Amino acid sequence: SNMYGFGTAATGEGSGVLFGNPHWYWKGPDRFYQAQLTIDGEANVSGVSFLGLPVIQIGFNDSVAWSHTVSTARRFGFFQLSLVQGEPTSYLRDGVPVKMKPATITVPSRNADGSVSDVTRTLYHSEFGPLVNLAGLNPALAWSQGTAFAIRDINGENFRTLRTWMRWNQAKSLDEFIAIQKEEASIPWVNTVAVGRGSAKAWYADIGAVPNVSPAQTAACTTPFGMAVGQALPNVPFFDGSRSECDWLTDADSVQKGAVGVSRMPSLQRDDYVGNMNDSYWLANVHAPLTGYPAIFGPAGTSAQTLRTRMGHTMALERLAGTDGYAGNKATSAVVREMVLGSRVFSAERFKDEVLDLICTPAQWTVNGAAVDAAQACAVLAAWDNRGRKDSRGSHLWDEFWSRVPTASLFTVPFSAADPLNTPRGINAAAADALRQAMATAIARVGQSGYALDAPRGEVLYATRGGTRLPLYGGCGAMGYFTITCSENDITQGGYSMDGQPNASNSYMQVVSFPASGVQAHTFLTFSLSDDPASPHHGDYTKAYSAGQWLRVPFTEAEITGNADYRTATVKELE
Amino acid sequence: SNMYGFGTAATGEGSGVLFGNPHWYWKGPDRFYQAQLTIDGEANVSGVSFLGLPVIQIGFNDSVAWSHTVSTARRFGFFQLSLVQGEPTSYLRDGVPVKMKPATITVPSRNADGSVSDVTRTLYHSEFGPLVNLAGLNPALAWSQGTAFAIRDINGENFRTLRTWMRWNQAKSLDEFIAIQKEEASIPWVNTVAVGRGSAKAWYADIGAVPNVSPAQTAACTTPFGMAVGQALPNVPFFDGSRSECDWLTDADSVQKGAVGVSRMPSLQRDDYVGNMNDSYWLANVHAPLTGYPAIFGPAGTSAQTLRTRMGHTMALERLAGTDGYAGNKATSAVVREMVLGSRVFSAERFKDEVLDLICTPAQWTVNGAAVDAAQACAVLAAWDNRGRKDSRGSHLWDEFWSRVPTASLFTVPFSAADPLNTPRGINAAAADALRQAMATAIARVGQSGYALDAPRGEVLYATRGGTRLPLYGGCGAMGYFTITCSENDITQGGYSMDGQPNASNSYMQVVSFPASGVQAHTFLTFSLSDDPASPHHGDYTKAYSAGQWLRVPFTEAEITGNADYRTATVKELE
Amino acid sequence: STYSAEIRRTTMGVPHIKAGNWGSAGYGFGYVQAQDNLCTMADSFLTYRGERSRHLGGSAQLVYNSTLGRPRNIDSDFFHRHVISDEAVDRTMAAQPAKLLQMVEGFAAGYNRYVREAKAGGSAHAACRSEAWVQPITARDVWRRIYAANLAGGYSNFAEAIANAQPP
């Protein structure tokens, strides 16, 4: 997922601009549903909920607009339990026995032959949370006579999340939006960016519910199994649950027991921009890196950023420098609408020329002892515009190649925290054999798919609606796309179809501004509102998305009733 | 898999007819590859091998033709180990400790970033065979301090299999074929049927390598764990490996230690026919059932046969009775070629009218409290010819329906061993509600697929070659098809495409006879010879299969050289 | 009292629910979500209630990807019954403002109204409208779905592991 908040230094207007772009499910009950709720005297909010949720989770009202992206901050931990002699369903707390709480649960289950029979299990809770079978993580981690493991999710006890969105749905200013975020400290596993009517500053935060452990506890409380499995569970506290001193801590300003206090969670306000594309809070704005927050939030200056984060901050800087090819140097709604669909490919912009210069002369190769003619692949990639637009030619050959390049020893200039958008870089000449092997495979895969090496991307990447393959643009984060349309289908199985259950992709999109006459929002719901192929709303929004034609979504009463497709009806009943 | 051997009384010619029809993989290394081997003064044999096998496994020569189907006979067992305590890698045998034999194995594994990590495990053998993790079968079956489990496969010590097929490739009569099968007792997991030049009787046998346990052992040696999972593993000996009297037995006429002796394994010769469609040996010929063989070979009268077994013997009886609609009453090569592709559907032939009579009046239903309009489903099914031919209409509605009908109390005439083809039967009037539920779901699934309820089957069931969907016929064994073309694809995902990795289906097919002039074979290799989409041999045979056009495969030198597509080339190199 | 919501639909079918109170806004929103997505939603209520296996087989996987991933039905059912127990639902509800409890009761009632309509007839949701698992739900069931969404960063990722934790 991506988001930007542009403040008034970036917009040159009296309000900022918010871009919300969660990359998320195209099918299933977590997918988004776009709607407006107008509750007389109480709320007027527009945006998306997951199906089955009754308040708006990402959206806007007359005063504030916001979005979310998944945060790197871990939300759970494990507790290793020391079991009471002869009673493997009891554990020791500072040497005193405590019984786990049993639940014997019976689930009716339909059989092969269509009959129904009961399945019964007795399952357990500890004071930390439910027992968890960690043998699948590693066999040594089994529930034995001496040890068991429980999992604690701090959201298990966080009953404040829905009411926080409800309060945000009703908020009358960015100031109130922020106060609500801090008062509730409930946001469960996402960053938040917001912009407000009349505020110079855009807001970024990872302020929500987060397990609170100290460095001293990490050093002293992590058990040997916790050490041994720690690399598979980075920054997840894996602690000795027989010692009360290892319980998660509570600060003076913690809203919830065992959670990090409000003043120790990262936030930032900027008049130019804040953004996040799923790396940690560190580079909410590249000119003002955030550091010094709890380790559990993730790295702040010691890990390279993803190619998508490098691409998303590059796009913001180049917009504000006026060097990206769009009009002027302000992040206004109209320019942001075009910029976020532009389907630039960071890996190609930065590394394609170095790659081709290293491997393409001669273009007749010997790869694993086999003659390989790469001349057409080299010529197609050289001509390609480094974009995943619908008419871009050869962009899929780049996807099949780059996704296979071994990144160990690929770059000669390592990550530097003082140059985090442009490092690592420097394609290593020692990688030439490995790059030819990856390219030979990519040529082979495009060959098996039926597409030409130079096919337009819109024929390879598509969504079918009403029998028509609607051409798409964008691509996968691994290649350093910002505009995400990321199929789970192998190219050799009919191309990059978006018709199954694609990887997290562009889903609800909003660009929201606050001109004088009132909030304005342009939107997409890429997969369309309805999952029923019979509905006219199964594929209409998808045709608009293929066309790049953002919806101006009506919001005032006059806008709704004046809309060209307006229909109304009343539903009423007792109770 | 199906096979028939018709004797000379059945064919009315001077030779029997052998029909081989393994249902098997359409991709991967166990798929079949058709070839002839002519080795000067040694062998002249034609048929198929799995890719990577050097002798012909199903095929013919100038004197004998034969085929295989997977047998119900179990070929493995488990041994429960009693561990020497504190030393869980040793086990007791009649009270004496025995060390398991360890192997520390390192496997190199490529990572996401291109580097290679070594992965190391120490694994174990017992005198029975390798240790096996049975916690997946039931969590109580973990390797503990007290108990472990080993698996023994009789074929792990059977080094005779390839040599047996080699000798068959060379055999100069059915008598010799039979003698080889008995001498080697090596066939590892299949039945065999064979016909020979100049023999009146066709041969059936499940004579091969099979664990030898007695009824008294099964009673004395099955451990309490063994009894508790025995129904999940029917007929698999699950024995106490701490007791030497529970070792698999050896007969005076056993060729291999621990295996059933030759005289205690089932076979039958018949003048009319033998056949098998994957049920046990019991009904090699329904007029002369086989009984009394070891329990491990499978049931011989306690169990109803599959709908495919009922269909396959019904087709043989009706051919010899002259009541199947083909001319005459003999199983000639020409009529067999047609009959085996005729795609009759046993469940529809026997039960469709009774189901429609019971549920189609009225044809507007209430199902789970919802209005359901079944009028079109009822009318389409009434009109359908009860076959899965390319032009049959509504056959895929029947597939989606019948596969969802609960089987408990569905029939009012229970299985009778005295008539295993015509029982169970008689749709129970009490099943009406359940049948309407199953039909409502079928209707909805066909709806979701985009096919009409009365679509012709060749539009639903197809193999794509060269960009063209070749129409196919046949179906899944669960519906009582004999002609098997059984997609793993859900109908809602583009229909019954055969282009992925379908379920076991028609693969190599041969109809072989021995007229006076020399053996004659008509064949298919349904998926075609080559896996390379560029090869002219990736789709040529499949186009023939779709057309129903059996290939007369050249065999004599004159036939090979006179073939319209004949090419020759010689490959040589220093040994 | 009566739930009453005005449903206005504009281009792309986007619904703008107008209501005089929170219960009535929930009624209109539950209705339009079901009207457009009944099959995905009715399937999802089986997941959060731990009732998938009864209808679809314990050994089948979840139909849709989501924050839960696609474990087997039997394991998912146990996970949801154990972790989203009646106590967890009780505790969740006891912590809410009256207006939100009223909203979620309206939401259940509006979803159920649409279920009645689908069972009666129509060309919509042909894929599932006559199936047994299309059925009315309760406010507590909506609370189960709401709590389930909180768990994405933690318990959801270990659903099968939690369902299969048993002492030796």
Binding site: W24, N138, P139, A140 | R121 | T67
Partner: peptide, 14 residues
């Protein structure tokens, strides 16, 4: 305890 038997879980929500 053997690292050659650790199976990392999925941890990125979405």
């Amino acid at each position: 305890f053997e690292p050659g038997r650790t199976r990392a879980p999925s941890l990125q929500v979405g």
